[PDB]
Symmetry: D2
Subunit: 124 residues, 4 copies
């Protein structure tokens, strides 16, 4: 199963586990997900976080919903060689979710050489 | 764990599990992944397969690689209402992978109302 | 040319043109792109903004770089019918760009029934 | 206009323009899009084709439809260095479109260091 390729862990001391944080404002839920909170993850042409996806499984429901996907596509690559463009997209993803439901939020991130990583938090 | 939202077994009545098939030609591995092979999954504005992702974990290695992602973006929507454009993208994905390695291939797919689905096959 | 399918205009009078705003903080450039600033764009199962992409062409250079892509994937769809999930992803995209270069930022957004839309701003 | 960053003609020496080919079978239109058909475009960790998108504008209509998007995500990167994984995703995209309409098909591709490229063909 695919779960055997997905890693998780303590974000407070790592650099791969996506950290999920949110702030509820009325019917709006602003979610921030990032890799490399405590320890910045490298962002080079050879080693970088490709994307972060956010999912939401409402409490008591059977099917998870993909809320969004953020792809970080600039990693220094240029005609002058790797790490020469001075253009890098940091692995920080923001999602504005409109819902009055509660449940669980899951984040799935992919490092180009270190596989898949996950994390989750309860959405009160 | 996000895996708690991923199903690997179809329920009788609707096909969701992405079926993986491949053909090895020299250094090339042609992979076909599809949802609803014989009995098609619905493809309406309201209910459809959004995408299929292909992953490869080489034998004996520790990090899975994302081979590709195919998004099926047309589902009949139009200014004249849902299911009126006569333009639909079928959930059939093809990937041309160049590798001489062996291992396991995983497929992850998403139904807009039925969550995540997975499958895997051994790449010999 | 694909440009014949891309529309542009005044966001103060329309509701499809992606509005670009940024803030330069040290070596970081925080870019906010959104559709429906003045006039909120519908976000229903039948009619919604699918994604917003950000591009950067550094001053004096020949090749544009894709900075990122944000996909808004929840639009009310559920097993209970269209617009019944109470889960919607608003078309607001945030990008954290690390660069000391100046140039032009382009935004490309896609509405599921109203085609492609663009906008641009000078990154000073 | 973003079109000022999109090229439609290759320069001798490197293939970038996505070549579109299709086959009509009943209500199904099988579309194949590829970069570097005759002369392969590089596919290294430092230089590679990131994705190909397919669009369809039905004859006489005003809004283009995105048919699909294929992301080629493996480019040799590994913990053992750039170009060491022996896993590369070739820039060949296949789309199965269900439609009885005619019109124009557009392809948009992106090289990580050579910007955006386009091409189009009439769907008879
Ligand atoms: Fe890493
Ligand atoms: Fe389904
Ligand atoms: Fe619209
Ligand atoms: Fe190139």
């Amino acid at each position: 199963m695919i779960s055997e390729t997905i890693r998780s862990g303590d974000w407070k001391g790592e650099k791969h586990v996506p950290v999920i944080e949110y702030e509820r404002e009325g019917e709006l839920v602003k979610v921030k997900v990032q890799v490399g909170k405590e320890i910045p993850h490298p962002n080079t042409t050879e080693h970088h976080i490709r994307y972060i996806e956010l999912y939401f499984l409402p409490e008591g429901e059977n099917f998870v919903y993909q809320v969004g996907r953020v792809e970080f596509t600039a990693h220094g690559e240029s005609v002058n060689g790797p790490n020469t463009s001075d253009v890098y997209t940091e692995p920080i993803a923001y999602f504005v979710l409109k819902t009055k439901k509660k449940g669980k939020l899951y984040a799935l991130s992919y490092c180009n050489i270190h596989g898949l990583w996950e994390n989750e938090v309860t959405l009160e």
